[PDB]
């Protein structure tokens, strides 16, 4: 893996961190290092959190399933663009504030240009989205962890991003949509001139197995037309008893019922069972749960056989019975997707009889039998003779008459009916053989690929005895998952190897094809066989032209009779149509299809190593429904980043707006140099990062899939969310600052505060007509809330004649006073007593009796302890009142940006989803606690330049932020709800 130190160092290369480091040059330039250092602190904290989450994603990915994600690089570009725009706007605003001779009522000892430049630098550091890469990394890593928690192991980080935008899912029917536990349901016996049949056809009859629970062997065979639910449930009753189902109804599987029909059913089941030597029934060693070993498709035949006998559990003598029939391994035909049948050979223990079914042929003795099982559509067409019932004594092969076209149709429409009801049908055939026939078969130079001698013969030796129908139960949650996919407007396509009527039936059962689609032929409009994907309608022709294929298959929903290698064409067609294809497979031959797909999906435990190595994600759940939850989580991962970017823009544009308005309207700047860095750290990082862990919205699984080209900010997030929050936040913060300064110092604009302080000019000594400037008195009006008195008071600063130094006097007189005259009765007796004796020595007393130096007091020592004068840097009551007002404005700004985190989370009103996330509660309260503590800790307040407020002052500062929560309860999220969240007008 990448070294941890290398990962930590690499994260400084993102454009936003680079811009912040550019602003960190102030620590080296002639500026305040104690405020430029905090930028490095913020960057280091973000880098530490991001490197921890990246290292943890390096663990959750790779080892659990076996450099920037395109979303990450796009969002880094977006963050760089936002930073550049903010820097340009703040450069214009700061140059405007410098061309104008702007200055603060406080900071009198410092050069105004440097102060405003540092404030602009702080605003730039705030407005640049330095937390964007960190939040994107956290969201992607937490999303991958959530996927793993929901049984979806993503192999690549880019897979998490791409899943949300996915618009089509292609899944195999078997294993993914329906569990592999196939169980037998019906079995059909074929024998013409039979005494018993269905609908008086006198040629075929259907039988039903019961019980049909998964892979459980005990049970029997009954008549389909007679077994209603009432008679079935009583058969289920007392099933723990020994085999006695004949007390309810005739059990054809009981060997004690030696009859002609039972003989034919036994012959068919024994022919089926001998083809299943690769599979065997078993039971778990620690639980009384049955199971199967070997091929999954061959499984239900053995279970079906056990219900009529032919099993070791029913009788220990079955081993010898199987041993009596030796097997010819040389001629065995293996089963594969290309042949679609398997042929097995055995020797008989008799001359010309097989399970009381006679193969008598003059001049020939049949010491061997060839058994075939496979799809009916590739064995029925080559059938030559059927079984025939002679009188009421025995069943013998009908060598006298071949199968006619009507006789073939007799089997054909029964196969059509049985292939419906979501049952797949297997056809079993036989051919009697002799020693010379076995020698001829062994003399064939061809491999087990063809063995054409078995199917075709001049004597017509090929007999199909009947069918076995087995159900493939859908997984319990597949219907709800497909309904959710339909609500999410993601197309679901089933790819299966079953026959076409079976495919359409199972699709209708699980809900791919609704009954509302019967207005058109669903038989051909959506469900088609793979033979249709060629210009000539047969697999011999290689392909059908793309310009017609893409238009033909855009309506198709179910593919039947598929092949593993054909999945490539489907993926190509869907990709050309514009969908983001997530295709599932096992990897035996469809690994290229998975790789060419946008989101390859390995089929978990059933999947091979090639599939797991070619896919983007692995379904350890072995279930289709996990893909739907995967899409849900992938959508949530983008939605959380969208909410975070909305928070960033909606707060960091309002910051610039209210700074610009304060500068334009000649107000004191609403935030200090480092107060805004503290604000940035207390509203991004916390709680803005806590938006990364938001649970899915109620409509994130209902909206259409997001196109890849769609920008992160649709105009829906601009007309609501960003702009109406920036305007409201600017209004709230500016009104808070104005009311704050009016409460704390009696004036809300810089001109009023500066004129509120009285100044005197002193003509220089060495320079003619040059004038220095000093202040000799200050006033202020501060609102008071107390038990004794509520209302305005006046506070003054003056040169104290008793102590011979500049002092601050608070609460000189009740109510606002235009000119404080200390000799009047309004003034507090202490202040009157302190100066009633007159000015100290060489000072003036004409103007209201304040201590102003005479006009000849000038010295070259500017502010060098001149008597009758407050020193530069002394905290006048105007300066202290302005600091208190700016502290209230700062707390209001923090609680206005922080409270936006509680209304960004969902378009629903915030009171419904308040408790939905706990990390946001932790981060929000950390922000609030550090805001309250940063204005009362003695160390912190000395560098933040904040003063600790009164209780009602804190409530007043917070209330201007709760007024910004009318962004939810009034406008505009109510407008958004009425326009889009309303189901119907």
């Amino acid at each position: 893996v990448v070294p941890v130190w290398l990962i930590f160092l690499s994260q400084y290369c993102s454009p936003v961190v680079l811009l912040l480091l550019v602003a960190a040059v102030a620590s080296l330039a002639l500026n305040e290092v104690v405020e430029g250092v905090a930028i490095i602190s913020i960057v280091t904290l973000n880098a530490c959190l991001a490197t921890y989450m990246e290292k943890s994603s390096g663990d959750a990915i790779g080892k659990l399933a076996e450099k920037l994600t395109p979303l990450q690089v796009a969002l880094n570009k977006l963050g760089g663009l936002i930073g550049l725009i903010a820097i340009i706007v703040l450069v214009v605003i700061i140059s405007l504030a410098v061309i104008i001779k702007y200055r603060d009522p406080a900071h009198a000892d410092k050069d105004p240009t440097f102060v405003i430049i540092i404030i602009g630098v702080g605003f730039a550091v705030s407005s640049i989205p330095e937390g964007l890469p960190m939040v994107v990394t956290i969201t992607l890593s937490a999303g991958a962890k959530d996927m793993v928690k929901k049984n979806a192991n993503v192999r690549k980080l880019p897979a998490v991003e791409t899943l949300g935008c996915c618009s089509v899912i292609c899944s195999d029917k078997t294993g993914t949509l329906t569990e592999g536990k196939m169980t037998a349901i019906n079995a059909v016996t074929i024998c013409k001139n039979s005494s018993l049949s269905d609908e008086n056809n006198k040629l075929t009859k259907t039988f039903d197995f019961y019980p049909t629970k998964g892979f459980e062997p005990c049970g029997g065979l009954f008549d389909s037309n007679e077994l209603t639910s009432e008679k079935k449930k009583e058969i289920v009753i007392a099933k723990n008893q020994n085999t006695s189902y004949d007390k309810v109804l005739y059990n054809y599987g009981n060997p004690s019922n030696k009859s002609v029909i039972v003989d034919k059913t036994r012959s068919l089941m024994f022919a089926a069972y001998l083809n299943s030597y690769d599979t065997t029934l078993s039971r778990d060693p620690k639980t009384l749960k049955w199971g199967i070993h070997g091929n999954m498709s061959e499984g239900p035949i053995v279970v079906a056989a056990a219900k009529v006998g032919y099993s070791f559990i029913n009788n220990p003598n079955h081993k010898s019975y199987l041993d009596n029939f030796q097997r010819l391994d040389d001629l065995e035909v293996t089963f594969n997707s290309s042949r679609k049948m398997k042929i097995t050979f055995y020797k008989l223990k008799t001359v010309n009889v097989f399970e009381n079914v006679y193969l008598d042929k003059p001049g020939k003795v049949y010491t061997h039998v060839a058994l075939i099982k496979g799809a009916p559509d590739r064995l029925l067409d080559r059938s030559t003779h059927l079984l025939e019932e002679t009188s009421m004594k025995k069943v013998q092969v009908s060598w006298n008459s071949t199968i006619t076209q009507e006789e073939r149709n007799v089997l054909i429409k029964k196969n059509l009916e049985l292939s419906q009801k979501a049952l797949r049908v297997l056809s079993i055939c036989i051919k009697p053989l002799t020693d010379q026939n076995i020698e001829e078969l062994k003399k064939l130079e061809d491999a087990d690929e063809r063995l054409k001698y078995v199917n075709y013969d001049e004597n017509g030796g090929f007999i199909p005895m009947g069918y076995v129908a087995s159900f493939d139960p859908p997984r319990p949650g597949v219907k709800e998952a497909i309904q959710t996919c339909r609500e999410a407007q993601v197309k679901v396509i089933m790819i299966t190897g079953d026959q076409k009527p079976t495919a359409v039936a199972i699709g209708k059962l699980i809900g791919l094809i609704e009954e509302k689609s019967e207005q058109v032929e669903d038989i051909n409009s959506l469900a088609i066989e793979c033979s249709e994907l060629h210009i000539n309608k047969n697999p011999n022709e290689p392909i059908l032209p793309n310009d017609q294929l893409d238009e033909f298959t855009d309506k198709i929903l179910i593919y039947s009779r598929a092949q593993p290698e054909d999945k490539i064409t489907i993926v190509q067609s869907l990709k050309r149509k514009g969908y983001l294809v997530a295709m599932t497979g096992d990897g035996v031959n469809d690994a290229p299809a998975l790789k060419a797909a946008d989101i390859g999906v390995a089929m978990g435990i059933n999947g091979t190593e090639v599939a797991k190595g070619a896919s983007e994600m692995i379904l350890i759940d072995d279930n289709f429904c996990t893909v739907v939850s995967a899409i849900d989580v992938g959508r949530t991962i983008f939605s959380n980043i969208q909410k975070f970017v909305c928070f960033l823009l909606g707060t960091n544009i309002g910051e610039i707006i209210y700074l610009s308005v304060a500068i334009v309207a000649q107000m004191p700047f609403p935030l200090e140099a480092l107060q805004i860095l503290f604000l940035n750290l207390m509203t991004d990082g916390c709680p803005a990062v806590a938006l990364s862990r938001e649970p899915p919205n109620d409509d994130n699984m209902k909206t259409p899939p997001r196109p890849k080209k769609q920008p992160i900010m649709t105009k829906r997030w601009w007309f609501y969310g960003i702009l109406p929050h920036t305007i409201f936040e600017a209004l709230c913060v500016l009104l808070s600052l104005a009311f704050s300064l009016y409460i704390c110092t009696g004036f809300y604009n810089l001109n009023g505060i500066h004129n509120l302080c009285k100044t005197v000019n002193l003509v220089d000594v060495n320079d003619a007509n040059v004038y220095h400037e000093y202040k000799y008195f200050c006033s202020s009006y501060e609102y008071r809330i107390s038990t004794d008195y509520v209302g305005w008071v006046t506070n003054v600063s003056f040169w104290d004649p008793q102590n011979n130094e500049a002092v601050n006097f608070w609460g000189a007189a009740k109510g606002k006073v235009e000119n404080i005259n200390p000799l009047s009765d309004i003034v507090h007796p202490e202040l009157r007593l302190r100066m009633q004796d007159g000015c100290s020595g060489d000072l003036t007393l004409d103007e209201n009796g304040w201590c102003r130096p005479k006009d000849n007091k000038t010295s070259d020592g500017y502010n060098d302890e001149l008597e009758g004068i407050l020193k530069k840097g002394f905290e006048d009551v105007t300066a202290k009142g302005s600091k208190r007002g700016r502290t209230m404005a700062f707390i209001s700004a923090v609680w206005c940006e922080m409270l936006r985190a509680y209304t960004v989370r969902s378009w629903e009103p915030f009171y419904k989803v308040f408790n939905r996330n706990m990390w946001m509660h932790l981060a929000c309260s950390i922000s609030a606690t550090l805001t309250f503590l940063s204005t009362c800790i003695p160390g912190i307040t000395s560098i933040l330049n904040t003063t600790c407020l009164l209780w009602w002052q804190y409530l007043l500062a917070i209330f201007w932020a709760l007024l910004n929560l009318f962004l939810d309860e009034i406008v505009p999220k109510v407008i958004y709800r009425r326009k889009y969240m309303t189901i119907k007008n």
């Binding site: 008195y789 006097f809 202490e830 309260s925 950390i926 609030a928 600790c948």
Partner: protein, 79 residues
């Protein structure tokens, strides 16, 4: 899966608010539907709300009885 210790952490958080957040931080490993994690969520909410309220009250008292009275300056009415 024990409900007792998150409840103890919730009660103890009334005397030190940082304890409530530590409660949620420590037992995040346990499954979400368990009663222990639900009481941990309650502990985090109680700790966070008490942290905000206690910071407000502590800071207001500290201001009104220390920072309101700078030693060297003079005070008159309503002071």
């Amino acid at each position: 899966n024990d409900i007792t210790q998150p409840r103890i952490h919730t009660i103890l958080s009334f005397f030190f608010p940082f304890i409530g957040c530590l409660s949620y931080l420590i037992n995040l490993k346990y499954p979400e539907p368990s009663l222990r994690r639900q009481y941990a969520k309650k502990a985090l909410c109680v700790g966070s709300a008490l942290s905000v309220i206690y910071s407000f009250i502590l800071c207001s008292l500290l201001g009104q009885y220390i920072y309101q009275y700078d030693n060297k300056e003079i005070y008159g009415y309503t002071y």
